[PDB]
Design a protein around this motif. Sequence first.
Motif, mmCIF file in Angstrom:
data_model
loop_
_atom_site.group_PDB
_atom_site.id
_atom_site.type_symbol
_atom_site.label_atom_id
_atom_site.label_comp_id
_atom_site.label_asym_id
_atom_site.label_seq_id
_atom_site.Cartn_x
_atom_site.Cartn_y
_atom_site.Cartn_z
ATOM 1 N N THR A 63 0.857 -1.171 0.000
ATOM 2 C CA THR A 63 0.000 0.000 0.000
ATOM 3 C C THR A 63 0.905 1.236 0.000
ATOM 4 N N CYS A 64 2.204 1.023 0.177
ATOM 5 C CA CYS A 64 3.223 2.026 -0.113
ATOM 6 C C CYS A 64 2.980 3.251 0.758
ATOM 7 N N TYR A 65 2.571 4.357 0.165
ATOM 8 C CA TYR A 65 2.403 5.620 0.838
ATOM 9 C C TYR A 65 1.116 5.674 1.648
ATOM 10 N N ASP A 87 -0.011 7.892 -7.683
ATOM 11 C CA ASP A 87 0.725 8.641 -6.667
ATOM 12 C C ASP A 87 -0.177 8.988 -5.485
ATOM 13 N N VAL A 88 0.486 9.420 -4.390
ATOM 14 C CA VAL A 88 -0.142 9.940 -3.172
ATOM 15 C C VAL A 88 -1.318 10.854 -3.449
ATOM 16 N N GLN A 89 -1.096 11.876 -4.273
ATOM 17 C CA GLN A 89 -2.142 12.862 -4.411
ATOM 18 C C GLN A 89 -3.330 12.247 -5.107
ATOM 19 N N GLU A 90 -3.108 11.145 -5.808
ATOM 20 C CA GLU A 90 -4.300 10.535 -6.367
ATOM 21 C C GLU A 90 -5.104 9.836 -5.265
ATOM 22 N N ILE A 140 0.006 20.907 -4.591
ATOM 23 C CA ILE A 140 0.955 21.494 -5.538
ATOM 24 C C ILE A 140 2.087 20.502 -5.860
ATOM 25 N N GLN A 141 2.385 20.344 -7.137
ATOM 26 C CA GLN A 141 3.492 19.486 -7.501
ATOM 27 C C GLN A 141 4.655 20.414 -7.832
ATOM 28 N N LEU A 142 5.769 20.217 -7.160
ATOM 29 C CA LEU A 142 6.889 21.123 -7.230
ATOM 30 C C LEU A 142 8.049 20.380 -7.914
ATOM 31 N N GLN A 192 3.735 18.147 -3.152
ATOM 32 C CA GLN A 192 4.399 16.955 -3.654
ATOM 33 C C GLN A 192 5.741 17.310 -4.306
ATOM 34 N N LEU A 193 6.756 16.532 -4.008
ATOM 35 C CA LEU A 193 8.054 16.767 -4.606
ATOM 36 C C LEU A 193 8.205 15.797 -5.781
ATOM 37 N N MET A 194 8.739 16.286 -6.916
ATOM 38 C CA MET A 194 8.674 15.582 -8.180
ATOM 39 C C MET A 194 9.923 14.727 -8.413
ATOM 40 N N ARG A 195 10.117 13.710 -7.573
ATOM 41 C CA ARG A 195 11.233 12.787 -7.638
ATOM 42 C C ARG A 195 11.027 11.625 -8.630
ATOM 43 N N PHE A 196 9.788 11.350 -9.109
ATOM 44 C CA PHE A 196 9.569 10.272 -10.048
ATOM 45 C C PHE A 196 9.338 10.783 -11.462
ATOM 46 N N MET A 197 10.308 10.542 -12.355
ATOM 47 C CA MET A 197 10.148 10.944 -13.753
ATOM 48 C C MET A 197 10.519 9.810 -14.671
ATOM 49 N N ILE A 242 11.866 6.694 -13.061
ATOM 50 C CA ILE A 242 13.013 6.513 -12.171
ATOM 51 C C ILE A 242 12.919 7.554 -11.065
ATOM 52 N N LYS A 243 13.545 7.237 -9.928
ATOM 53 C CA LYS A 243 13.548 8.100 -8.770
ATOM 54 C C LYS A 243 14.779 8.984 -8.783
ATOM 55 N N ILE A 244 14.586 10.292 -8.725
ATOM 56 C CA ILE A 244 15.694 11.184 -8.453
ATOM 57 C C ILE A 244 16.043 11.126 -6.964
ATOM 58 N N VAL A 292 8.453 10.184 3.272
ATOM 59 C CA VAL A 292 9.792 9.727 2.924
ATOM 60 C C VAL A 292 9.741 8.287 2.385
ATOM 61 N N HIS A 293 10.678 8.001 1.487
ATOM 62 C CA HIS A 293 10.788 6.719 0.792
ATOM 63 C C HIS A 293 12.260 6.317 0.675
ATOM 64 N N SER A 294 12.585 5.036 0.381
ATOM 65 C CA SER A 294 13.986 4.604 0.208
ATOM 66 C C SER A 294 14.206 3.781 -1.053
HETATM 67 C C1 LIG Z 1 5.928 4.054 -6.381
HETATM 68 C C2 LIG Z 1 6.519 5.465 -6.071
HETATM 69 C C3 LIG Z 1 7.862 5.530 -5.295
HETATM 70 C C4 LIG Z 1 8.519 6.882 -5.396
HETATM 71 C C5 LIG Z 1 8.789 7.473 -6.631
HETATM 72 C C6 LIG Z 1 9.336 8.753 -6.714
HETATM 73 C C7 LIG Z 1 9.672 9.405 -5.585
HETATM 74 C C8 LIG Z 1 9.458 8.819 -4.349
HETATM 75 C C9 LIG Z 1 8.908 7.571 -4.251
HETATM 76 C C10 LIG Z 1 5.459 6.101 -5.196
HETATM 77 O O1 LIG Z 1 4.964 5.437 -4.289
HETATM 78 N N1 LIG Z 1 5.043 7.361 -5.435
HETATM 79 C C11 LIG Z 1 4.630 8.170 -4.293
HETATM 80 C C12 LIG Z 1 5.278 9.529 -4.362
HETATM 81 C C13 LIG Z 1 4.954 10.251 -5.675
HETATM 82 O O2 LIG Z 1 3.529 10.352 -5.681
HETATM 83 C C14 LIG Z 1 5.505 11.686 -5.771
HETATM 84 N N2 LIG Z 1 5.106 12.329 -7.033
HETATM 85 C C15 LIG Z 1 3.902 12.938 -7.075
HETATM 86 N N3 LIG Z 1 3.445 13.594 -8.073
HETATM 87 C C16 LIG Z 1 4.245 13.716 -9.196
HETATM 88 C C17 LIG Z 1 3.742 14.380 -10.317
HETATM 89 C C18 LIG Z 1 4.473 14.449 -11.464
HETATM 90 C C19 LIG Z 1 5.765 13.909 -11.519
HETATM 91 C C20 LIG Z 1 6.290 13.291 -10.414
HETATM 92 C C21 LIG Z 1 5.515 13.166 -9.251
HETATM 93 C C22 LIG Z 1 6.005 12.466 -8.075
HETATM 94 O O3 LIG Z 1 7.123 11.972 -7.993
HETATM 95 C C23 LIG Z 1 5.420 9.396 -6.846
HETATM 96 C C24 LIG Z 1 4.882 7.978 -6.768
#
Ligand SMILES: C[C@H](Cc1ccccc1)C(=O)N1CCC(O)(Cn2cnc3ccccc3c2=O)CC1
Length: 332
Positions: free
Chosen positions: A14-16, A87-90, A142-144, A197-202, A207-209, A243-245
């Motif tokens: 269930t992750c986040y 993602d979380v915000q969804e 807000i997605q930053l 939200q911090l934009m670490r997934f692209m 991939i995770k920044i 936070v995630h790892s």
């Molecule tokens: C599965 C994934 C793990 C993860 C990926 C990236 C960073 C941290 C951990 C996970 O569980 N996620 C939860 C967190 C996010 O929701 C954050 N997030 C939200 N909105 C965006 C909009 C546009 C682009 C990028 C993001 C974004 O990274 C990503 C998915």
Amino acid sequence: KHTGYVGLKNQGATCYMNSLLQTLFFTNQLRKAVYMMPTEGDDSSKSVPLALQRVFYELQHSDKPVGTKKLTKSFGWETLDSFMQHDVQELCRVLLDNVENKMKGTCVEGTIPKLFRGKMVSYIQCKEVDYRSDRREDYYDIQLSIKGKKNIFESFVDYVAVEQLDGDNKYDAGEHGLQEAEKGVKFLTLPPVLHLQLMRFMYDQNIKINDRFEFPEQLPLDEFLQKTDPKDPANYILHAVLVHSGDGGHYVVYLNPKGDGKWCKFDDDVVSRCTKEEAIEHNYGGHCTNAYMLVYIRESKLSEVLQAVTDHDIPQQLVERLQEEKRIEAQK
Ligand SMILES: C[C@H](Cc1ccccc1)C(=O)N1CCC(O)(Cn2cnc3ccccc3c2=O)CC1
């Protein structure tokens, strides 16, 4: 326990979800309102509102790590990859939309908006020909951008920065034909509780920044508003750090539940006290455990939002209906 707060059970990828649940749970005004929700005659299995009343009640009273199973079924994310494909915000938007709808024609109508809805202006200006076009646009989060941005401030600046429309994707100014233009955004309002939200997934998959992105315990936002107000300036207090790892990924949430700067880590069922440095600075990144989401509360609103919640606040029909189900559960 060690902390007075209790954990949540891990029952899936269930992750986040668990981080998000403890963040919503510690948004005491939201909690109070969820408890007032007319879930009298709701189907006990397909009602997202009730299911969430369950979890909140449970995190408030039990000594024992709480469970999420009825909620995951509630809103119908039950596949292996259902949480990995969102993602979380969804999720957040699924939980709050449900609860906002249930709260219509009630005492507590309009709570979710009041808590988390802000207002933005989106404008398009043509350079040569004189044409401009504004319009309001509500946001609940807000997605930053991170990549190449050292700290929050730089992300905001980039968000409200102007963008050009030349040559290839010129702007249809309608009567004036295709036109070169600049479009930008500006804040009219920032809500009481500010989900960033911090934009670490692209994206060849996503991939995770993991680079260093910094954020402060205290965040002055007045600069980013279209028109300020010296009575209520836009100063935010940090409340949660999700936070995630790794890429292999662990998911924790740091919190200072009362806004007093006394921090706890919430690792599912294990909830220890910690330092501000593990909560904040240890989550910046650098060269891969680090922050993907931040919740700030407006200092003007701290007290109302984090208002104290006793067991008197849960009503009677609910308490007894919640009581029964445990008993039927006890029949085993
Ligand atoms: C599965 C994934 C793990 C993860 C990926 C990236 C960073 C941290 C951990 C996970 O569980 N996620 C939860 C967190 C996010 O929701 C954050 N997030 C939200 N909105 C965006 C909009 C546009 C682009 C990028 C993001 C974004 O990274 C990503 C998915």
